[PDB]
Design a binder for this molecule. Structure first.
Ligand SMILES: *[C@@H]1O[C@H](CO)[C@@H](O[C@@H]2O[C@H](CO)[C@@H](O[C@@H]3O[C@H](CO)[C@@H](O[C@@H]4O[C@H](CO)[C@@H](O)[C@H](O)[C@H]4NC(C)=O)[C@H](O)[C@H]3NC(C)=O)[C@H](O)[C@H]2NC(C)=O)[C@H](O)[C@H]1NC(C)=O
Ligand SMILES: *[C@@H]1O[C@H](CO)[C@@H](O)[C@H](O)[C@H]1NC(C)=O
Ligand SMILES: *[C@@H]1O[C@H](CO)[C@@H](O)[C@H](O)[C@H]1NC(C)=O
Lengths: 131, 49, 107
């Protein structure tokens, strides 16, 4: 069973590199696509860019590719590096697993499949504020 | 005078297509190839797009 | 964000705020404050493993039908917010979850 524990710095200096990481226990590392969730206070659930098991990371265009993520093979951990942070962006972070599923509504040969992800496991949550 | 134009697609956007069974088409095309061999000196018959 | 009240002891249906532009495969997640949210329905058809049948959704048969989430009465788990995540062909990837819907029960 996955005991999803997130390493929480608690306080991060503004305009500095961040190390916010989630640990995964007793699970295959490349079994599912790896995704992260960050919810600002007084805001709806916001999903930041996910990283594939092929070490290719989708990025939210709003974040301007500030986040850099590289999954650590040894530590079973998803290391997030956030640069030039501000008090606004810092918030609670959630670690999640995404199951890629494709919905086909026509001829696959032409190409009418779109991939939709399902959040099988959700993060416990770690709250980080600027210091 | 009313000019009828295409406004939008309600739903998915899907390419138009025509489906032809491969087995029946290739059977008939083999028959056509033999009949063309009869009139074309038993040469190998090559259909190309 | 405007929460919708739910009748006490009666199952209630919430309609997804955003509208699909094509064939849709919605994702439903029930957020839990201070804990890990639990996914409710995937592909709007079948419940995930370990999830009760209390949550069900409309099929995508035909067009002109809106996806909905079913809940069982009112409880502590039902009180917390849940989200509707629309996946339609035309829009593409759905980066934003969307507006939140919350259950409120009192008296
Ligand atoms: C010509 O030949 C091609 C093959 O070369 C053939 O292509 C097939 O086209 C059909 C549609 O006519 C596709 O079937 C789709 O499959 C999806 C999922 O597999 C199904 O969607 C389910 O049903 C409804 C949606 O309508 C929804 O309530 C339900 O929830 C959906 N399922 C899920 C899990 O969400 C449908 O059966 C259908 N989708 C539609 C109609 O939108 C095949 O996938 C195509 N197969 C290939 C190989 O491309 C085509 O039909 C042929 N055309 C003729 C005229 O003969
Ligand atoms: C075409 O453009 C007009 C105006 O830019 C817009 O109102 C209309 O919805 C568009 N149609 C499609 C199919 O995009
Ligand atoms: C075309 O349609 C007919 C009847 O609708 C069916 O019997 C036949 O198999 C179809 N052919 C293909 C290639 O789908």
């Amino acid at each position: 069973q996955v005991q999803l524990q997130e390493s929480g710095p608690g306080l991060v200096k503004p305009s500095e590199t961040l190390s916010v990481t989630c640990s995964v226990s007793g699970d295959s590392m490349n079994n599912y696509y790896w995704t992260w969730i960050r919810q600002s206070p007084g805001k709806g659930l916001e999903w930041i860019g996910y990283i594939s098991d092929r070490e290719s990371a989708t990025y939210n265009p709003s974040l301007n590719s500030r986040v850099v993520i590289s999954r650590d093979t040894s530590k079973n951990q998803l290391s997030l590096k956030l640069n030039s942070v501000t008090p606004a962006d810092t918030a609670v972070y959630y670690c999640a697993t995404a199951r890629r599923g494709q919905r086909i509504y026509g001829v696959v040969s032409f190409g009418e499949f779109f991939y939709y992800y399902s959040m099988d496991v959700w993060g416990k949550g770690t709250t980080v504020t600027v210091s | 005078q009313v000019f009828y134009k295409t406004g939008d697609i309600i739903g998915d956007i899907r390419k138009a297509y025509c489906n032809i069974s491969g087995a029946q088409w290739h059977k008939v095309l083999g028959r056509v190839a033999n009949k063309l061999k009869e009139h074309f000196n038993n040469k190998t018959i090559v259909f190309k797009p | 964000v405007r929460p919708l009240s739910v009748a006490l002891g009666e199952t209630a249906r919430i309609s997804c705020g955003r509208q699909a532009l094509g064939s849709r495969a919605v994702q439903w997640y029930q957020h839990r404050p201070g804990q890990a949210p639990i996914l409710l329905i995937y592909n709007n058809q079948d419940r995930p493993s370990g999830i009760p049948e209390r949550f069900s959704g409309t099929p995508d048969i035909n067009f002109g039908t809106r996806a909905t989430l079913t809940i069982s009465g009112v409880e502590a788990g039902d009180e917390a917010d849940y989200y509707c995540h629309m996946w339609d062909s035309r829009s593409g990837f759905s980066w934003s979850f969307g507006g939140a819907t919350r259950l409120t029960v009192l008296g």
